[PDB]
Design a protein around this nucleic acid. Structure first.
Ligand SMILES: Nc1ncnc2c1ncn2[C@H]1C[C@H](O)[C@@H](CO[P@](O)(=S)OP(=O)(O)OP(=O)(O)O)O1
Ligand SMILES: [Ca+2]
Ligand SMILES: [Mg+2]
Ligand SMILES: [Mg+2]
Length: 428
DNA sequence: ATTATGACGCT
DNA sequence: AGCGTCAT
């Protein structure tokens, strides 16, 4: 009763740019706006690989991880923008720089955790307290929540009108003189996220979706419920119904092998079905940490903090060499290591100037032809100078003895991936 | 030939 | 440290 934690202590949002690389290209090229459009990497093999898709194009069945030639079969009028190529490889600088535009705006409102190039968690607990104090017990108008969905409502015929019906039910029910009502806190959080999203669109042109809830996992889940250009409030009370038909794989961290094992071992399908196991039962199958996490998570409770981190922890450069393009000679391997290192040096030097830090470790990863995993080998060495020729030489030295070829020049088995990653930053 | 990233966990 | 998982 009065002692069972309910995980309602925080207000957390997750902001996710809509089809982000596509929006970056549509801002730059107005001809692409409001069209079925996708962003592609490379071009020669099957038209290039699609890595982002506008919502107009998704309606035709275009997806990421699709060849452009195949997407054109589904959507003959599909427009394409190509990722920049520099030094023989895809170069994502435009999108990283657009990301910084958005992250810096979000940071004006609250502390953020950079989750990916186009998504950030927002810790709104303090901002909500402040806005509540300023509101002086004034009711919250629907006008302040023009793009908000309240998950689970309406309960007990435009699409927009059902949004409004649900919002009206929620607001009509809200108790406002309790400054500590979790539902009220979430609602004020949603007001702030409307403001944040309006600022992002005003100041960058970019639209986004967002989730507002009491923790990162629910905020992430919420964000995906109403896309694009909308935000969703998932209250603590909404969790039992929401989870009752929610496939386990939809919850962040459960979309892979662990989630599959939860399903197989327990013989369940939906997140809510987890509530029938004891904490010790779940720990016995999935380990102490996962078991405790699952026990709380299936009740809507998670404690992972929004980490105060706006900048990436690593700066990396990688290229696959699939099929016949696999690197089979010394000079080929060296040359591509150099290309990678030159991009790495450029990005590192900019990072040092912008962010007052220096990387101290270089991680070198490769894949050999006919190998199991993403990485066949991972080796680290010191990163003492931002110099591409040096880093490339060092990376070679580190991967030297992978070459089983007794022949001097030849490289066997051929390399299907090269990866340089700068890590272990220190203030400078 | 489902590419180029990036964070975090395990031992 | 090096490898594996999960995700964008
Ligand atoms: N698998 C993969 N490879 C390369 N680039 C990716 C990949 N996934 C995402 N991205 C890039 C391209 C995206 O514009 C960007 C954001 O990823 P996400 O959020 S999953 O998808 P978006 O393109 O923003 O559409 P969406 O969020 O509106 O569903 O990261
Ligand atoms: Ca996105
Ligand atoms: Mg996304
Ligand atoms: Mg995203």
């Amino acid at each position: 009763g009065p002692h069972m934690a309910t995980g309602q202590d925080r207000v957390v949002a997750l902001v996710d740019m809509d089809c982000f690389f596509v929006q970056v290209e549509q801002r730059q090229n107005p001809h692409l706006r409001n069209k079925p459009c996708a962003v592609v990497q490379y071009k020669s093999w099957k038209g290039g690989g699609i890595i982002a898709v506008s919502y107009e194009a998704r309606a035709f069945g275009v997806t990421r991880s699709m060849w452009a030639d195949d997407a054109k079969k589904l959507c003959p009028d599909l427009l394409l923008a190509q990722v920049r190529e520099s030094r023989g490889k895809a170069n994502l600088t435009k999108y990283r720089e657009a990301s910084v535009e958005v992250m810096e705006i979000m940071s004006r409102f609250a502390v953020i955790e950079r989750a990916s190039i186009d998504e950030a968690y927002v810790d709104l607990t303090s901002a909500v307290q402040e806005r509540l104090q300023k509101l002086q017990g004034q009711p919250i108008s629907a006008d302040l929540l023009p793009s908000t969905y309240i998950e689970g409502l309406p309960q007990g015929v435009q699409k927009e009108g059902m949004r409004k019906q649900g919002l009206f039910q929620w607001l009509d029910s809200l108790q406002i003189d309790n400054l500590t009502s979790p539902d009220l806190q979430l609602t004020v959080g949603a007001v702030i996220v409307e403001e944040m999203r309006a600022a992002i669109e005003r100041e960058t042109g970019f639209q986004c979706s967002a989730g507002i809830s009491h923790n990162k996992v629910l905020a992430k889940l919420a964000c995906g419920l109403n896309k694009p250009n909308r935000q969703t409030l998932v209250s603590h009370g909404s969790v039992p119904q929401l989870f009752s038909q929610m496939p386990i794989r939809k919850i962040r961290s459960l979309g892979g092998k662990l989630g599959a094992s939860v399903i197989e071992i327990l013989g369940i399908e939906y997140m809510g079905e987890l509530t029938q196991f004891t904490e010790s039962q779940l720990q016995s199958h999935f380990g102490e940490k996962n078991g405790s996490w699952l026990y709380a998570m299936c009740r809507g409770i998670e404690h992972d903090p929004v980490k105060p981190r706006q900048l990436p922890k690593t700066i990396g450069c990688s290229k696959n060499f699939p099929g016949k393009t696999a690197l089979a000679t010394r000079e080929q391997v060296q040359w591509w290591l150099l290309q990678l290192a030159q991009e790495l040096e450029e990005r590192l030097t900019k990072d040092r100037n912008d962010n007052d830090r220096v990387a101290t470790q270089l991680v070198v990863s490769i894949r050999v032809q006919g190998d199991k995993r993403l990485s066949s080998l991972r080796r680290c060495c010191a990163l003492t100078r931002y110099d591409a020729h040096k880093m490339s030489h060092d990376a070679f030295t580190v991967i030297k003895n992978c070459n089983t070829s007794g022949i001097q020049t030849e490289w066997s088995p051929p390399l299907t991936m090269l990866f340089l990653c700068a890590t272990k930053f220190s203030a400078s």
